[PDB]
Amino acid sequence: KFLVIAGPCAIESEELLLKVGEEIKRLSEKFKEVEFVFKSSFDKANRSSIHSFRGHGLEYGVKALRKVKEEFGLKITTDIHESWQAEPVAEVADIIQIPAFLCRQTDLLLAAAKTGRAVNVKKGQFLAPWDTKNVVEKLKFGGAKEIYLTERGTTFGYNNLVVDFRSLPIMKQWAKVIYDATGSVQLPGGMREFIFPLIRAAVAVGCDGVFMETHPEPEKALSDASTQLPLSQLEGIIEAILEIREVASKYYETI
Amino acid sequence: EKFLVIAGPCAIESEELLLKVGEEIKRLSEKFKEVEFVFKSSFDKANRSSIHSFRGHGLEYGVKALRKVKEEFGLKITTDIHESWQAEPVAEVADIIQIPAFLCRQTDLLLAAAKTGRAVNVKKGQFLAPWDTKNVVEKLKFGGAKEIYLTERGTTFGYNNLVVDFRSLPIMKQWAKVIYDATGSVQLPGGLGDKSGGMREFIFPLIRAAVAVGCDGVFMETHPEPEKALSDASTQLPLSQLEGIIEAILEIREVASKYYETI
Amino acid sequence: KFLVIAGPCAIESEELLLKVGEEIKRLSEKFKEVEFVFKSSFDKANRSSIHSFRGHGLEYGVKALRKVKEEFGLKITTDIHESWQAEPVAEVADIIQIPAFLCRQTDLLLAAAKTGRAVNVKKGQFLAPWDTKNVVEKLKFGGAKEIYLTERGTTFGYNNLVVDFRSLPIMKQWAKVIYDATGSVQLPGGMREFIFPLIRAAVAVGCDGVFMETHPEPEKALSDASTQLPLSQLEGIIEAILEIREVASKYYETI
Amino acid sequence: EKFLVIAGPCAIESEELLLKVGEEIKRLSEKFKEVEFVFKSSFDKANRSSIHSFRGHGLEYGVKALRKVKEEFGLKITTDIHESWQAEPVAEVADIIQIPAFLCRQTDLLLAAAKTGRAVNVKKGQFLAPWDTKNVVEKLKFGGAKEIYLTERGTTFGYNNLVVDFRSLPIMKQWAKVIYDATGSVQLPGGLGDKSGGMREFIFPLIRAAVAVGCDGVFMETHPEPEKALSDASTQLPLSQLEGIIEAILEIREVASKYYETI
Ligand SMILES: O=P(O)(O)OC[C@@H](O)[C@@H](O)[C@H](O)CO
Ligand SMILES: O=P(O)(O)OC[C@@H](O)[C@@H](O)[C@H](O)CO
């Protein structure tokens, strides 16, 4: 079924995770046609500044995510940054996320695949759509069976990302495709006003799921404060994309 | 508001070609009554890459051919101008005067079109940022234009490639009605060396994106047999597929419409 | 010999043209190895704003340029915007300049070629280096014998131009190549600090000439105030590029 | 200041290959005494496009091979790390620890390299703007790095193509010494499908541009027979051409030097 990956960018506390998980659970019960996956990072390992918020560590993060899966029965996904993190994260993560800058790091991909979990690779801002075929091949070689590729924009001049929707049908040739609605509008080194319009475009074109970072109060977020979707707006957007998908799906081109 | 569909063969290869396409557009206009159709065709391809490529049969012949389409089918007409002096004669038949993408900053051309009293549709230059179309609209208003359109047709992305930044739709909507050029946006400028290339397989997906985001109309160059077209053979939509595409975008527009943001 | 095309962006008055022409003449006498061509536009036909300075008209402009050639014996170059302007401009213009946005307008190119004058086409920000071969062919078909292609940057994201120096050797295959040092640093819709560094790069790579818009007081210029080179700095830059060219020329690759 | 020339085969194909290249670099270091040479080679290509491409013979073998080069020729050494744990063992032989372009924002990797006390050279990510390297240098200084380099190696320009924006040289010079990667800047990422492409014909012209603009050193991957290289076969410079290139850039640097702007 259609996938909706959502949650706060970073694990600011398992308190926040529980408050967001509660809403994700409610939507999960309301939209039985959709498969929800809770997401949050235990570490922002690639912040621009050395003085920015990274997180509370792997152990604290896995614990918090563990509480979300136990308390709400929701699937989990988080990203890893170095090979050794794949094993401990796989304990709770149903889907292991590979950061965009690291989409070409062979050992990280292999380490994720070895865990037997599903793998979701964020497409690097430097990669062409067709370049992702090799990424999928590495994962298959590593034993991965459930593979996703996430569109999150491509480098367009400096401090700007553009979404080339031609990427969706191209990547669908070798993997399930996810559209990152919040990451695609960020200005590297973003505009929330474009999150909804572009996600509508994503489902009109055709994808297997959407990815959205959401926070009760984005402006207070410790990471991605300018792009995280306010929690209260999630339901409306999901209902909207489901309706558009229902009508547009008749026209999705065959593989 | 009535959705606009601008369509027709890229170039006026012959008056016969125009009437054939015009007949189909007229038929669709009778079926899709909620759509405002405007027949398009260029009397001159003044910016071909190669000196050896087809340009046209002249302004005189073209206008005459376009007038025949309007007379026979009662369809609104649009064609593009390339130099200031062409605005007057063209305004005699054209309901909408089109400004080529490379010429979107040529003040005199914009002014020439604006003083005719006809509607003006400016193709957004591949070098222009969305927010910089505000001054383009200002020039037209200054020149007397009362009905203005801005057409998204892609932006230079590396060499011989164009990308469509859909954020341009809501940005440009701030100052003019917005049209999405479904066939021009998938062309590969100079992709074939002496001619430009294109990827027809992406025409439909991107037009679905356009209506989901929200626009005031779509622009599509269509030809009975694109493979044999004298210009844009790689991007013109087979005429037989026009009906299906229009039905689809009207369906997607309807379902997405309640979510279009207010400007 | 090496070409240096320089002058104020727009003809704000024949007074300005004479003051700049006087300096250009002095340098012309100092650098006999270089061929100087005086440049200025009689009309800025593509300003972003309808309220910006365009000029004093074709007639007034040609007259002013005519005075420069008569009073200083300098060659002249100015740009045309519509086909009908080629004939009257050719009366004084030794080199007819084709604006970047208009580099694909067949009739403008043909009209320029018909005059029998040399033609210098500014490479559109949307053109790939190899795409210029067809531009040259149009001019040759139109009777042009002296053809130049000028590098002035390529669209790089929004409101930014990047100079891909690979363009110089590529375009040299079919035409003489000129580097526009002032236009290449402008930010469409620039930084003067990069004019000199990039022009040094241009001659190190290898070109047939440089193009620079210069004004006694750029900040007071009616057009391109942010990129025009202060007149007093022209001599130093020319001497500098001549020295670099002298040494680097030993390494310029054969056609 | 002494000009830096970082050169060597892309990957450590064998200890034999390293000694062959090392011998030539040593010879050039004896001729060009005004240049500081640093021998480069990767013990692992951890980011190949294809799972079937050559990666290397492991960290242990690589370090041993690099130490042999340093021992036999007395040359400074540089190699890249891919994960934090590699900084310590690599610092035992490497005078300069190299940070891969895709990893230029990985905080822990930068920190790992900085605490070794060795010099650190960061390849500028193809996604990074020049002004955003300021924070990269800040992270390294925070981590204890006292000798920092930033290497220009091109920026994403459309698909499978890189462009060198030379404005980056004077911008980055504001916070670190700047190196120009002459061979990486002409590669066509994923250009050959399973492998990346490249245009060797542009290596020399662009390196001439780099020294005319002004930089603190150049980086060049070189191999006796590039055509047979196991990695970057399309961009590595034939070893026989290294001497000529170095002589040329030293000549251009000298004549342009009086014009380098003060930061
Ligand atoms: O085929 P060439 O001559 O390159 O012309 C490209 C066409 O696609 C042309 O009509 C284009 O969209 C012009 O603006
Ligand atoms: O040939 P592939 O595997 O694409 O790798 C590209 C090389 O050019 C590679 O070593 C590159 O510069 C990696 O960063």
Copy the structure tokens of residue A12: 């600011």
The angstrom resolution of this structure is 1.8
| Ligand of minimum distance to the alpha carbon of B188 | 1
Find the discontinuities in chain C where C to next N exceeds 2.5 angstroms and give the residue preceding each: 189
Q: At what angle do helices C195-205 and C234-248 cross, to 10 degrees?
A: 30
Count interface pairs C-D at CB distance under 8 A.
92
Spell out which residues of chain A touch residue C156, defining contact as CB-CB under 8 Å.
157-158
With CA atoms as reference, report the closest residue to C23 among C14, C13, C36, C11.
C36
Show the CA angle centred on residue A41, arms to residues A38 and A44, nearest 5°: 160
Checking DSSP bridges between strand D187-188 and strand D197-198, what pairing results, if any? antiparallel
- Cβ atoms of residues A222 and A10 within 8 Å: yes
Specify the 3-state DSSP secondary structure of B3. strand
Residue D106 CA to ligand 2 centre (angstroms): 19
Is residue D18 classed exposed, middle or buried when 0-12, 13-18 and 19+ CB atoms within 10 A define those classes?
buried
- As a whole number of angstroms, the distance between CA B114 and CA B112 comes to 6
- As a whole number of angstroms, the distance between CA D262 and CA B87 comes to 54
Residues B169-173: contacts with CB under 8 Å, at least 24 apart:
B169/A197, B169/B210, B169/B213, B169/B214, B169/B215, B170/A193, B170/A194, B170/A197, B170/B213, B170/B214, B170/B261, B170/B263, B171/B130, B171/B131, B172/B124, B172/B130, B172/B133, B173/B214, B173/B216, B173/B263
With CA atoms as reference, report the closest residue to C206 among C152, C145, C154, C255.
C255
DSSP code per residue over chain D: -PEEEEEE-SB---HHHHHHHHHHHHHHHHH-TTEEEEEE-BS--TT-SSTTS---S-HHHHHHHHHHHHHHH--EEEEE-SSGGGHHHHHTT-SEEEE-GGGTT-HHHHHHHHTTTSEEEEEPPTT--GGGGHHHHHHHHHTT-SSEEEEE--EE-STT-EE--TTHHHHHTTTSEEEEETTGGGEETTTTSSS-EE-GGGHHHHHHHHHHH--SEEEEEEESSGGG-SS-TTTPEEGGGHHHHHHHHHHHHHHHHTTPPP-
Q: Residue type for B238, please?
A: P
Show the ligand 2 pocket: residues with CB < 6 angstroms.
D 45, 47-50, 53, 100-101, 184, 187, 190, 195-196, 231-232
Residue B194 CA to ligand 2 centre (angstroms): 32
Per-residue b/e over B30-57, b at no fewer than 16 CB within 10 Å?
A: eebeebbbbbbbbbbbbbbbbbebebbb
The torsion defined by the Cα of C95, C100, C105 and C109, in degrees rounded to 10, comes to 10
3-state SS, D168-213, equals HHHHHCCCCEEEEECCHHHEECCCCCCCCEECHHHHHHHHHHHHHH
Which residues are paired to A7 by β-bridges? A213
- Cβ atoms of residues C3 and C34 within 8 Å: yes
Specify the 3-state DSSP secondary structure of A159. coil
Indicate the number of domains in chain C: 1
Cβ-defined contact of B102 to C105 (cutoff 8 Å):
yes
Looking up residue C228, the CATH number of its domain turns out to be: 3.20.20.70
Q: What radius of gyration do chain D's Cα atoms show?
A: 17
CB neighbours (10 Å) of residue C145?
11
With CA atoms as reference, report the closest residue to D110 among A101, A158, A8.
A101
Q: Is the Cα torsion angle D184, D185, D188, D190 positive or negative in sign? A: positive
Copy the structure tokens of residue A127: 């990669």
Copy the structure tokens of residue C203: 């001659």
Checking DSSP bridges between strand C161-162 and strand C154-155, what pairing results, if any? antiparallel
Smallest Cα distance from D145 to chain A, Å = 14
Specify the 3-state DSSP secondary structure of A125. coil
- As a whole number of angstroms, the distance between CA C134 and CA C140 comes to 10
Spell out which residues of chain C touch residue A158, defining contact as CB-CB under 8 Å.
156-157, 160
Q: A210: part of which helix (H) or strand (E)?
A: strand A209-215
Cβ-defined contact of D129 to A158 (cutoff 8 Å):
yes
Q: A176: part of which helix (H) or strand (E)?
A: strand A176-180
Spell out which residues of chain A touch residue C158, defining contact as CB-CB under 8 Å.
156-157, 160
Checking DSSP bridges between strand B177-181 and strand A161-162, what pairing results, if any? unpaired
- As a whole number of angstroms, the distance between CA A107 and CA B165 comes to 34
Which residues are paired to B39 by β-bridges? B7, B77
B195 pocket-lining for ligand 1 (C-beta < 6 Å)? yes
Answer whether D105 touches A (CB < 8 Å): yes
Find the discontinuities in chain D where C to next N exceeds 2.5 angstroms and give the residue preceding each: none
- As a whole number of angstroms, the distance between CA B105 and CA B88 comes to 19
- Structural domain of residue C193, as residue ranges? 1-255
Answer whether C158 touches A (CB < 8 Å): yes
Checking DSSP bridges between strand D177-181 and strand D162-163, what pairing results, if any? unpaired
Which residues are paired to C75 by β-bridges? C37
- Cβ atoms of residues C28 and C74 within 8 Å: yes
List, in order, residues 6 or more apart from C191 with CB less than 8 Å away.
C185, D167
With CA atoms as reference, report the closest residue to A188 among B10, D126, C159.
D126
In a 13 Å sphere around the CA of C191, the CA atoms on its Cβ side amount to: 13
DSSP state letter for B12 = -
Of D99, D156, D231, the one to substitute when testing ligand 2's pocket (max ligand atoms within 8 A of C-beta) is: D231
Specify the 3-state DSSP secondary structure of B220. strand
DSSP state letter for B42 = B
Given its phi and psi angles, is residue A157 left (phi above 0), alpha (psi -120 to 50 degrees) or beta? left
Q: Is the Cα torsion angle A255, A211, B261, B174 positive or negative in sign? A: negative
DSSP code per residue over B226-240: GGG-SS-TTTPEEGG
- Cβ atoms of residues D46 and D11 within 8 Å: no
Residue A134 Cα distances to A102, D64, D234, angstroms: 14, 32, 19
Residue D41 Cα distances to D70, D195, D228, angstroms: 12, 19, 16
Residue A145 Cα distances to A136, A178, A180, D30, angstroms: 10, 16, 22, 56
- As a whole number of angstroms, the distance between CA C124 and CA C103 comes to 6
Smallest Cα distance from D197 to chain C, Å = 16
- As a whole number of angstroms, the distance between CA A217 and CA A221 comes to 7
- Cβ atoms of residues C216 and C230 within 8 Å: yes
Backbone angles phi, psi at C175, to 5 degrees: -165, 170
Copy the structure tokens of residue B33: 């009554």
**In this complex, which chains have at least 3 CB pairs below 8 Å with chain A?**
B, C, D
Cβ-defined contact of A201 to B214 (cutoff 8 Å):
no
With CA atoms as reference, report the closest residue to B217 among B151, B131, B124.
B151
In a 13 Å sphere around the CA of B250, the CA atoms on its Cβ side amount to: 18
Checking DSSP bridges between strand B76-80 and strand B35-40, what pairing results, if any? parallel
With CA atoms as reference, report the closest residue to B125 among A227, C158, C175, C92.
C158
Helices (H) and strands (E) in chain B, counts: 8, 13
- As a whole number of angstroms, the distance between CA C241 and CA C211 comes to 12
DSSP code per residue over A39-104: E-BS--TT-SSTTS---S-HHHHHHHHHHHHHHH--EEEEE-SSGGGHHHHHTT-SEEEE-GGGTT
- Cβ atoms of residues B102 and C104 within 8 Å: yes
DSSP code per residue over chain C: --EEEEE-SB-S-HHHHHHHHHHHHHHHHH-TTSEEEEE-BS--TT-SSTTS---S-HHHHHHHHHHHHHHH--EEEEE-SSGGGHHHHHTT-SEEEE-GGGTT-HHHHHHHHHTTSEEEEEPPTT--GGGHHHHHHHHHHTT--SEEEEE--EE-SSS-EE--TTHHHHHTTTSEEEEETTGGG------GGGHHHHHHHHHHH--SEEEEEEESSGGG-SS-TTTPEEGGGHHHHHHHHHHHHHHHGGGPPP-
CB neighbours (10 Å) of residue C30?
12
**In this complex, which chains have at least 3 CB pairs below 8 Å with chain B?**
A, C, D
- As a whole number of angstroms, the distance between CA B169 and CA B214 comes to 7
Q: What radius of gyration do chain C's Cα atoms show?
A: 17
With CA atoms as reference, report the closest residue to D259 among B189, C163, A209, C239.
C239
In a 13 Å sphere around the CA of B154, the CA atoms on its Cβ side amount to: 26
With CA atoms as reference, report the closest residue to A132 among A173, A82, A87.
A173
CB neighbours (10 Å) of residue A56?
17
The torsion defined by the Cα of C76, C79, C84 and C88, in degrees rounded to 10, comes to -20
- As a whole number of angstroms, the distance between CA B64 and CA B57 comes to 11
- Cβ atoms of residues D205 and C205 within 8 Å: yes
Q: Residue type for C63, please?
A: K
Q: B15: part of which helix (H) or strand (E)?
A: helix B15-31
With CA atoms as reference, report the closest residue to D43 among D19, D23, D61.
D61
- Cβ atoms of residues B149 and B180 within 8 Å: no
Per-residue b/e over D233-253, b at no fewer than 16 CB within 10 Å?
A: bbbbbebeebeebbebbebbb
- As a whole number of angstroms, the distance between CA A97 and CA A213 comes to 14
SS3 content of chain B, % helix, strand, coil (to 5): 40, 20, 40
Specify the 3-state DSSP secondary structure of B248. helix
| Ligand of minimum distance to the alpha carbon of C131 | 1
The residue whose CA has the least distance to atom 5 of ligand 2 is: D48
- Cβ atoms of residues B143 and B114 within 8 Å: yes
The nearest alpha carbon in chain C to A155 belongs to C157
Show the CA angle centred on residue D60, arms to residues D194 and D98, nearest 5°: 65
Copy the structure tokens of residue A60: 């604290």
Q: Residue type for B133, please?
A: T
Q: Is the Cα torsion angle B156, B161, B163, B168 positive or negative in sign? A: positive
- Of B103, B127, B131, nearest to C125 by CB-CB distance is B127
- Cβ atoms of residues C237 and C153 within 8 Å: no
How many residues belong to chain D? 263
Spell out which residues of chain B touch residue D157, defining contact as CB-CB under 8 Å.
158-159
CB neighbours (10 Å) of residue A36?
22
- As a whole number of angstroms, the distance between CA C181 and CA C210 comes to 7
Helices (H) and strands (E) in chain A, counts: 8, 11
Which residues are paired to B198 by β-bridges? B187
- As a whole number of angstroms, the distance between CA B252 and CA A114 comes to 42
- As a whole number of angstroms, the distance between CA A235 and CA B1 comes to 28
Q: What radius of gyration do chain B's Cα atoms show?
A: 17
In chain C, what is the straight-line distance between the N-terminal and C-terminal CA atoms, in Å? Answer: 17
Residue A43 Cα distances to A59, A222, A223, C28, C64, angstroms: 11, 12, 10, 64, 67
Q: A120: part of which helix (H) or strand (E)?
A: strand A118-122
The torsion defined by the Cα of D18, D21, D27 and D31, in degrees rounded to 10, comes to -120
- As a whole number of angstroms, the distance between CA B218 and CA B7 comes to 8
Of B43, B47, B82, B151, the one to substitute when testing ligand 1's pocket (max ligand atoms within 8 A of C-beta) is: B47
Answer whether C189 touches A (CB < 8 Å): no
Residue C178 CA to ligand 1 centre (angstroms): 26
DSSP code per residue over B163-204: E--TTHHHHHTTTSEEEEETTGGGEETTTTSSS-EE-GGGHH
Find the discontinuities in chain A where C to next N exceeds 2.5 angstroms and give the residue preceding each: 189
Which ligand 1 atom sits nearest the alpha carbon of residue B48? 3
- Cβ atoms of residues A162 and A188 within 8 Å: no
**Which candidate in C160, C163, C164 is best for mutational testing of the A interface (most A CBs within 10 A)?**
C160
Which residues are paired to D135 by β-bridges? none
The nearest alpha carbon in chain A to C160 belongs to A157
Residue C146 Cα distances to A79, B22, B221, B231, C103, angstroms: 60, 46, 38, 30, 16
Is residue D227 classed exposed, middle or buried when 0-12, 13-18 and 19+ CB atoms within 10 A define those classes?
exposed
Residue C10 Cα distances to C24, C97, D6, angstroms: 16, 13, 47
The nearest alpha carbon in chain C to A159 belongs to C157
With CA atoms as reference, report the closest residue to B82 among B67, B64, B65, B62.
B62
